[PDB]
Amino acid sequence: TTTVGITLKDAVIMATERRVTMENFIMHKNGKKLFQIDTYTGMTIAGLVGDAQVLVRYMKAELELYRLQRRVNMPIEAVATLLSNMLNQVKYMPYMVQLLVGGIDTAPHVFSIDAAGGSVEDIYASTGSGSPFVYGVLESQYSEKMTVDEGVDLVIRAISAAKQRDSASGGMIDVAVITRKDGYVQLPTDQIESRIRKLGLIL
Amino acid sequence: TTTVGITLKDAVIMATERRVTMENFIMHKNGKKLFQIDTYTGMTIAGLVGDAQVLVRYMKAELELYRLQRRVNMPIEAVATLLSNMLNQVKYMPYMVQLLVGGIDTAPHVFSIDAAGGSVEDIYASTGSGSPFVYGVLESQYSEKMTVDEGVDLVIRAISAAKQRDSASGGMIDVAVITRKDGYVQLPTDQIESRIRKLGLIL
Amino acid sequence: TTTVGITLKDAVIMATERRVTMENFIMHKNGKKLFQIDTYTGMTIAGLVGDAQVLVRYMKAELELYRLQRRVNMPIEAVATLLSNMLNQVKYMPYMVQLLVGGIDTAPHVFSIDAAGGSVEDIYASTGSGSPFVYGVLESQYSEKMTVDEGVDLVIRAISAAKQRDSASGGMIDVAVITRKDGYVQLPTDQIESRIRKLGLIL
Amino acid sequence: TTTVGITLKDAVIMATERRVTMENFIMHKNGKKLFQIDTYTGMTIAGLVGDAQVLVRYMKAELELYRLQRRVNMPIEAVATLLSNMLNQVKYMPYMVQLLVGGIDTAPHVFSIDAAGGSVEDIYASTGSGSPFVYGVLESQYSEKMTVDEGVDLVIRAISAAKQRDSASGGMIDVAVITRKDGYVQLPTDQIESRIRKLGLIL
Amino acid sequence: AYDRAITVFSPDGRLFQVEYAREAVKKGSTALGMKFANGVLLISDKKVRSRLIEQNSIEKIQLIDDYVAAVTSGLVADARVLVDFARISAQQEKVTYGSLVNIENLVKRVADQMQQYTQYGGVRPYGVSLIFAGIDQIGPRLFDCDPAGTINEYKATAIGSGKDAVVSFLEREYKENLPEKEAVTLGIKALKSSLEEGEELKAPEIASITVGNKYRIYDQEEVKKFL
Amino acid sequence: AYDRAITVFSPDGRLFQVEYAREAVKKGSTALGMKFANGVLLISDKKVRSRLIEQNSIEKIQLIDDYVAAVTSGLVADARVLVDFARISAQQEKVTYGSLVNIENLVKRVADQMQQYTQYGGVRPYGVSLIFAGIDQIGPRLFDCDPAGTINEYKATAIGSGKDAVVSFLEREYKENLPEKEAVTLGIKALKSSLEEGEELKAPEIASITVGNKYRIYDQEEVKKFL
Amino acid sequence: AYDRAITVFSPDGRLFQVEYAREAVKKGSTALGMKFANGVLLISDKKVRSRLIEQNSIEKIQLIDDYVAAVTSGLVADARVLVDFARISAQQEKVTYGSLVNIENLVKRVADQMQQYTQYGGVRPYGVSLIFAGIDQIGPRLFDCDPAGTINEYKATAIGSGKDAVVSFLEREYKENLPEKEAVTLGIKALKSSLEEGEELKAPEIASITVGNKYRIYDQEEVKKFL
Amino acid sequence: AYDRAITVFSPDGRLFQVEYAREAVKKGSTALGMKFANGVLLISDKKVRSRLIEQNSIEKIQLIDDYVAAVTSGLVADARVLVDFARISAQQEKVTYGSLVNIENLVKRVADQMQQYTQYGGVRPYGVSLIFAGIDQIGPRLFDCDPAGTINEYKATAIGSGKDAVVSFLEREYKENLPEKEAVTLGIKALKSSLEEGEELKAPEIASITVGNKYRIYDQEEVKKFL
Amino acid sequence: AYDRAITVFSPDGRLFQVEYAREAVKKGSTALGMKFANGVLLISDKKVRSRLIEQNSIEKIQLIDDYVAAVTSGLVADARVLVDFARISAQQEKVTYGSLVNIENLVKRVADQMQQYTQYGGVRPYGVSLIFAGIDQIGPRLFDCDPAGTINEYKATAIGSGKDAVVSFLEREYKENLPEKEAVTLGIKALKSSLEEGEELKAPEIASITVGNKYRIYDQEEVKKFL
């Protein structure tokens, strides 16, 4: 699997592949690894499937209860701290997962959490099997002076490189841009195919 | 063992072989791996026998209690989420099973659940020992523009390929088509033998 | 050890050998592996001796309490489901046993239960060390159009083949026929020796 | 990773690198390993990331509750004793971490705590992967007659030697000087780059 | 005196607290149940408190599964807790045994839950009576259960306010093995014999089951055909 | 005064709460049991509350297994909980030891359960007496057990309302080692001697066992032959 | 007498303690709820104790999620503990099943929590009634729940002091499937019919949902448009 | 009557035990809190019992952290246990979430702790009211909490003996968004309006915070400048 | 009335049970404590019940460690249990933190132990007041603690029967930062001002500490030099 999250000027772009295996034997050509966790923040999944879906259900529940009790959204540092305490309260019956939670509160953030619950900020991050490839291309091409369109083009080029050079990733890429103005908006597959055919990555 | 579940236009077809071993030593030439779990949804079994029969008893009980308390059937996403939480509450004394639950509520679904409780949707799925063969033939012949008759013919051709090319599967195939109009109807063995003799798979 | 259970027209015949070892070293030339578990159903034993005798005591107790509380006998599906739930509530301090419970309620049944609690019906079944031999002869000679006498002759021929070709089995065969009319009747050893001397299996 | 803590005349200087890996695969070029734990004392981290961040959260909480209940800061011997009792109450589900807590109460201190909770004082200490290098240069150049500027120059020369000769360390060095007069002050990155360019360590 | 605690016998050995809980049953609506040829039915009156109430909602006949059903009378909150306990207990027996062979032990588990609170201090009894009706492997069963926990199996009974009247009319008129239409007609006449005349029977609930079939709630029009 | 709690002795050292629970027993139907030649029997009257009641249902003679049986009098819900506790205890002894060798310890376990609730605050006693009858490896046993927990083994006894009368007639008429027909005839005459004349004995329940056999309920016609 | 403990039935079988907890409900502000065409709404009056109180704070309509909402009346501390228990229970059902398919079991879990304290000694009941309103997969649901635990599903209701008056006005004036504006106008007229004239309605809270949409609080100006 | 237990409702549905605990609040010293432009303050009177007391010791304004503070009134032992529970709860929320984002749930945890003892038998309520003041990510918050557990967020309030006076003066004189010096001057005038004239205000405690800053206790001279 | 249970507030919000436990304090011997220049001392009277009593045994000044000490008044058995709980709590804080940095939390742990029994039913309060005196890293501390759990830090105080008199004399005569001999002379004069003249002061206990030193009990002759 592969995930990618990019913080740029006033936005954060998170995208995944959709191919779930669950065996060697790729089994599901259209999974779901990009989850909206709250009205201004999302979460991506790069581990064991069942444990991670339990994590997504729990975090949706806790952040919705939070927004209800306090009439305001949770900050990104708070949700990563919560997620880290959850993963680190049990590490000897552990969750084998690599979580990546991004979102915007007053400034965009994308935080990475390992299986031991080490929350750490970075301006771009990636997790999964085909992760060093997208770290390579994001080390070579990413600039923090990008727009949203250049950012999502960079993200699609990244996940296309990971799909070309890795067995575990693959399938149709899905991308969601979360910004403060329009909120959390997941791009439809027509615009994603449009950017794939425009950037010369289709085969 | 082998299972198969196909979602098509307004129906879902699930079929299994019937041969249970329980040893190397095939022991029961007529088992039962296709279970009706509720009046519009069914469940197929591809793991350790005892654990899976306990799972079938529990899910029959919980869905019947649900239909009684709420006067409506359970959705398919809800039953897969329930089944995933059940398998993932205990994974260090784990159930070694691969469940596949299909059914129709307002649109047909067939969901696959591994031993760790990773629920994931797909338009056709299969589990068991002789599963890659039926994935091969369903990759080559399946179209979503089929009727019910072409679908059940595809399913019988699939399980016939798996019976021909695998030791663990075998025995008399049993098929059940669940649709919204006529509900859950399991085909009698006479029609199954009729389709076997018609499609040129009998030997 | 070896057990055998046959369902025929309106009866079920269950027979065992009687040789218990408990070591390599055959130690008891006359054990007891065929137990009447209720006034119309019986149980046979093919595993570790102590655990299985505890199982027989518990099932005698539970079925007698059942018949007392409800003034009717327990069905065979219910006793196999009960026995499966008992063996599967504890499988990590497990019972190493292979149970085979037969009986008649409105139709004859003989159900097989492995050490993991996978209850499964079959029209004839066998468990134990010398079990594939009696599966061979019951695959070659058994017909469902038999009487009771042809059935018990088939059973004695089966267990005689298993005694001839296996070390763990042996000793004097004991047989019990359970039918709805005369109930559960265990044949005396004189009739068993008579059938052995008649069928030409004595040596 | 590498940490360094130096006690000199009336001050204590603690600095770390900022590179977190979390894999082999250096992943975060700007982490955070130097934490202010109270208004006159700080803590540095050289172990597993998640466990150590949990430790930092707990010690911030306990020392803030302490300062609130008693209207005075905690002594350094007390915070190291507390931290040692915390790490040694659980050592068979242990924390794999090497903590180093420095600060000033009436005299400067820097205490080292291993994974088993052995608190021990020293006038300079270091933990982490690239720790023997900074012990070498602090054995060769450190004098207790230094000022604050000579001290922070020594610290930057130390961590520069560790960054040059070790894979696990690296990234931008961050330094904090804690003294009784001005309290806990973390140097901005401009002064750190100024000292790097002045001392002839930039490349 | 011997009066204000569940754990105190009278000098005649009575529990007045339990019989007071039995007096709670008499303020409920009248329901009846009766056996007929290969089957059993339940009929229940309802208080219609206002015209703003939902009709198609909280109903006096409740299903316990596709082969056990029940009606209640008394404290309605206690009654709903009881019906939910009965449903959970039936599903536990189905997990354990694969099927429900005797309705009587479902009734026994509910009744032992009710008896346990006529004994221990700090709890009150359940002010509810129940009628269970269904098909099991013995045949059609019909029970009642009361705040004491006493179980009785019957041909026909009532619970509720008009209970005595509905019993007495059945004490003149009930016959075994009626066809289903005649049995429901007898039940509606029995329920009408408990009203105080002038007051007329609005649309009641009726359920029924026959051997080899699941339940069958009459809709309102099929009920109107008998009024 | 010394009166309204189970944990309070009197100045004469009596528990009035227990004796009130014993007064609960006297409101039940009369049942008797007696030993005869190689066997033991139980006879029980019944209240037939109405004609709508099932005959072939809740019965005053209950089997505890195939080799212990029992009759009860008093609070019927408590009595049913007691008979089920006795059944579970008998099956536990059969798991542990393979057989039931002495009925007396089954009676002791039931009576210790009954004694435990004449001591701790927050529970009431059981307002039930029981008679146990059966065959064990000692021979025919016959017991009674009361709300206090007191156990007695007898040749013959009653419990219930007419108990004294049925005792007094046996206090004139009982002999050991009667044949079974004579013993049942003596029991029916004993049960008739407790009625108030004019009132006549409707069909009672009778069970019995001889040594080496299993259990044996008389059907109603075999009972009619002695009326 | 039968009066000062939750665990004591009356000789008519009533719990006066529970009904006193129901009298606690009548001291709260009036709130109402009603179903309309593809939707459901809630309206609530408020005591404005002084001018120093925050308006934009503790509010009588509380969200339970994005697809269940609720109003309360009675003891406000108990009511807040109840709304938070309802929120935690809704989130537990969402973790277990992925969604909330029937609001009725959320109401059932809250009502079983309320019923549990009408039974065990040492606790008091909850002196609060609640109205739940929302969309589930069945449709628009609208409930009330009371200190006894009794659940009722309605077309329209009130709780609070003016409840009867509001119910009576709806007992003349409510029709199904109104458009949202007409339904809110009917609700405001209903709430005005419970006041004692001269006293005038200050700005109330109104929430509403239609099928397929999320939640929607009217702000104060949109409420002013109907006063 | 309905009077001497926490678990007993009145026939009007009141808990007199809780309101009696609310009467314990009125014997404490008057404290007030108010919001001003980007900030919030607390002012508190003190009983100076003797001249031998330490001034610089047990103080009526207590810090809960660097970003929540509180004043109390009532039983001082209960109040100190409450402030320590609030401090431990704040530090638990900081461990779990890294920061305190809303003061309201710290208040809710303290108030649920207080509500829990208005319900269970064998405990008494907490005879203390509290005012919480601070900055969170929503803004300046100001609360009170009472023995019932009722939470209210305000612009300005008092607790203690002179509360009804100090509210009433604020009911004439409070304006939003005052500068800090004017807000403290208004508060000192409010506290003086609760005294009985002749009696004069000795040196009170005042704390305050603005957004983006930490905590700030006035020393005594800075307080003297406003007297 | 509001009088015979710890868990019952009065209508004015008082716990008379706690104040009666405070009346238990007034029957003990008078003890005092005071701060002086870089130090703190304790003085205590004793009842000498007979001449057969051991002098050099159970003493009113008890050490809690080498850097906290305490005197008690009230029920002597409760007081001994309290001093032992204080010693165990001090040693637990020394294990956890290596040293005792503030005496105030040792006092807080003892006072929370005392407050916990002014709240839960089935226990009585502790009928003891305590004075703690010692050196910590803040300086010389001096506290008292009472049956309610109320903590106060002082310059000087008494507990016991003559407390008021010893307070009032200190309310005329105490000055800060006295040398140690003058401070003890002031304390002995204070203790004499509480006696009823004619009655004369036999040999009292005096302890004291200065900053940087350990503990120091006066022997009897060094006490005689001040009488």
Side-chain angles (χ1 to χ4, degrees), chain G residues 51-58, chain H residues 35 153-156:
Chain G
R51 60 96 174 167
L52 294 175
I53 309 293
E54 292 292 334
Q55 192 279 129
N56 59 6
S57 179
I58 295 96
Chain H
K35 292 182 184 180
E153 180 181 2
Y154 290 151
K155 289 182 186 298

Side-chain angles (χ1 to χ4, degrees), chain E residues 32 34-35 41 43 156 166 169-170 172-176 178-193 226, chain F residues 51:
Chain E
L32 62 87
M34 66 181 69
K35 291 182 182 179
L41 62 94
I43 298 176
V166 179
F169 181 78
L170 292 175
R172 292 188 296 272
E173 294 291 328
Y174 181 75
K175 292 188 287 184
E176 291 181 355
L178 295 174
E180 184 177 5
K181 187 180 290 292
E182 293 180 354
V184 181
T185 300
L186 182 63
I188 299 300
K189 188 175 175 182
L191 184 62
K192 288 179 184 179
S193 67
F226 292 159
Chain F
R51 60 96 174 166

Side-chain angles (χ1 to χ4, degrees), chain G residues 196-218:
Chain G
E196 295 178 353
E197 59 90 19
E199 182 179 2
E200 293 179 354
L201 183 62
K202 293 184 265 75
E205 303 170 9
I206 302 162
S208 67
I209 188 181
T210 62
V211 175
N213 296 115
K214 286 185 185 178
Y215 274 162
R216 191 262 182 95
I217 303 296
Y218 291 175

Side-chain angles (χ1 to χ4, degrees), chain D residues 97-147:
Chain D
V97 75
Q98 296 180 359
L99 300 172
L100 184 146
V101 46
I104 180 167
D105 51 357
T106 182
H109 295 289
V110 48
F111 296 165
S112 178
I113 290 96
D114 58 351
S119 173
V120 54
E121 320 190 356
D122 206 72
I123 60 172
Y124 62 95
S126 171
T127 53
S129 300
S131 178
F133 305 97
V134 301
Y135 272 110
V137 61
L138 265 64
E139 185 66 27
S140 297
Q141 298 181 2
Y142 169 72
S143 175
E144 68 270 14
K145 300 295 189 291
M146 286 178 181
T147 64

Side-chain angles (χ1 to χ4, degrees), chain D residues 167-200:
Chain D
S167 63
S169 297
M172 190 66 203
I173 172 178
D174 55 350
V175 61
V177 52
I178 156 70
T179 180
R180 183 65 177 171
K181 182 178 183 292
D182 290 333
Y184 182 86
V185 47
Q186 183 168 358
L187 278 76
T189 182
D190 296 331
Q191 185 175 1
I192 300 169
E193 290 178 354
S194 297
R195 301 299 183 96
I196 288 170
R197 290 179 181 176
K198 188 178 94 274
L199 290 173

Side-chain angles (χ1 to χ4, degrees), chain D residues 21 23 33 36 46 75-77 86 91 106 135 137 155-157 160 169 185 188:
Chain D
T21 165
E23 281 94 1
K33 295 182 183 294
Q36 182 179 3
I76 309 299
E77 184 177 0
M86 183 180 178
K91 65 180 179 292
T106 182
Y135 272 110
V137 61
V155 167
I156 293 169
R157 289 174 65 85
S160 296
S169 297
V185 47

Side-chain angles (χ1 to χ4, degrees), chain E residues 4 25 39 48 50 79 82 90 108 115 123 132 147 159 164 168 173 203 221:
Chain E
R4 298 177 184 178
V25 175
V48 178
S50 178
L82 284 172
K108 282 177 185 172
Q115 189 272 332
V123 303
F132 292 98
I159 58 176
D164 292 330
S168 295
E173 294 291 328
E221 295 178 352

Side-chain angles (χ1 to χ4, degrees), chain C:
Chain C
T1 184
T2 181
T3 60
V4 57
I6 286 179
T7 289
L8 54 95
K9 288 183 180 180
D10 284 323
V12 43
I13 300 168
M14 289 185 287
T16 60
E17 53 88 19
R18 291 183 293 174
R19 175 179 290 175
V20 174
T21 165
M22 189 175 176
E23 281 94 1
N24 299 116
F25 180 61
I26 69 100
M27 186 179 176
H28 303 281
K29 293 175 73 66
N30 194 359
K32 183 176 175 66
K33 295 182 183 294
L34 174 58
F35 295 99
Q36 182 179 3
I37 212 69
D38 193 1
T39 64
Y40 288 101
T41 172
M43 184 187 292
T44 66
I45 293 301
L48 191 147
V49 180
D51 292 333
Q53 288 183 354
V54 168
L55 263 291
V56 172
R57 294 179 186 95
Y58 185 81
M59 286 300 161
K60 284 185 181 180
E62 186 71 29
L63 270 71
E64 186 172 5
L65 177 64
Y66 192 86
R67 185 181 66 245
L68 265 49
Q69 287 184 355
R70 303 188 180 191
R71 293 176 293 171
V72 75
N73 299 115
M74 194 189 288
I76 309 298
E77 184 177 0
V79 63
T81 298
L82 176 65
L83 191 62
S84 297
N85 286 120
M86 183 180 178
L87 291 179
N88 203 359
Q89 279 175 354
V90 49
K91 65 180 179 292
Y92 293 96
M93 297 296 173
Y95 296 96
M96 292 79 166
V97 75
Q98 296 180 359
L99 300 172
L100 184 146
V101 46
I104 181 167
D105 51 357
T106 182
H109 295 289
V110 48
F111 296 165
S112 178
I113 290 96
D114 58 351
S119 173
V120 54
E121 320 190 356
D122 206 72
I123 60 172
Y124 62 95
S126 171
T127 53
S129 300
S131 178
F133 305 97
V134 301
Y135 272 110
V137 61
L138 265 64
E139 184 66 27
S140 297
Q141 298 181 2
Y142 169 72
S143 175
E144 68 270 14
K145 300 295 189 291
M146 286 178 181
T147 64
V148 180
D149 290 332
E150 294 179 354
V152 65
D153 287 331
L154 176 64
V155 167
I156 293 169
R157 289 174 65 85
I159 300 298
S160 296
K163 287 191 290 183
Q164 289 296 321
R165 305 296 301 175
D166 182 75
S167 63
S169 297
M172 190 66 203
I173 172 178
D174 55 350
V175 61
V177 52
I178 156 70
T179 180
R180 183 65 177 171
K181 182 178 183 292
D182 290 333
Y184 182 85
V185 47
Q186 183 168 358
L187 278 76
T189 182
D190 296 331
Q191 185 175 1
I192 300 169
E193 290 178 354
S194 297
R195 301 299 183 96
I196 288 170
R197 290 179 181 176
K198 188 178 94 274
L199 290 173
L201 298 172
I202 190 66
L203 195 279

